[PDB]
Amino acid sequence: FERAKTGDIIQGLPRIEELLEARKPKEACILAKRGGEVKVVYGDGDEAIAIKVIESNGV
DNA sequence: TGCAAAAAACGCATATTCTCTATGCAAAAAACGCATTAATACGAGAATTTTGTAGCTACTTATACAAAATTCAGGAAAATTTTTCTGTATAATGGGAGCTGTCACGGATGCA
């Protein structure tokens, strides 16, 4: 089962230092070059759990 | 239970009279004066005489040389303790002791 890794005893003394020295909050790395739109749900038509990201103007 | 009323007491007629307010007597204190004697103090004399001043004299000390008769600081032996060095001869042939339950981070390497 998906299970709680959320919180609402969250964002406390630890959840700030990770931004103070500016570490890797979420360690993500999404890019940008503008398109941008609903983009199906994951890029191109998505599919069974397919995964991509988003586009409007762009090449 | 209202008084009218009688007798004896209790109130308007003086003797008595007796504490009482009132002056002359008298006796001894006292204090004042006659006063007398003695003592408290003035006068003179020369005697002691201590203090005040000078010079002499004896004691006391200012000072100038220094090795007195005694203290001490090294110097150089011992005296005993202690310290460093050297030496003693069978065989002996690879070292124990915890680290193994922390979370998270930042490089820094290895390993295909």
- Tokens 């979420």, located at residue: A26
Measured between alpha carbons, how far is A23 from A27 in angstroms, rounded to an integer?
8
The alpha helices in chain A, defined as continuous H runs, are 14-20
> Could you give the count of Cα atoms lying within 13 Å of A14 in the half-sphere of its Cβ?
3
Measured between alpha carbons, how far is A15 from A26 in angstroms, rounded to an integer?
11
Measured between alpha carbons, how far is A46 from A53 in angstroms, rounded to an integer?
9
Sign of the dihedral through C-alpha A41, A47, A50, A54: negative
- Within 7 Å of a protein beta carbon, the nucleotides of strand B are 105-106
Name the experimental technique: cryo-EM
* Nucleotide closest in space to A22 (CA vs C1'): B105
Tokens of A24: 């890797």
> What SS3 class is residue A13?
coil
Give which of A52, A20, A49, A24 is closest to A38, Cα–Cα.
Answer: A52
In whole angstroms, what separates CA A4 from the centre of its chain? 18
The resolution of the experimental structure, rounded to one decimal in Å, is 4.5
Report which DSSP code applies to A5: -
Measured between alpha carbons, how far is A8 from A1 in angstroms, rounded to an integer?
20
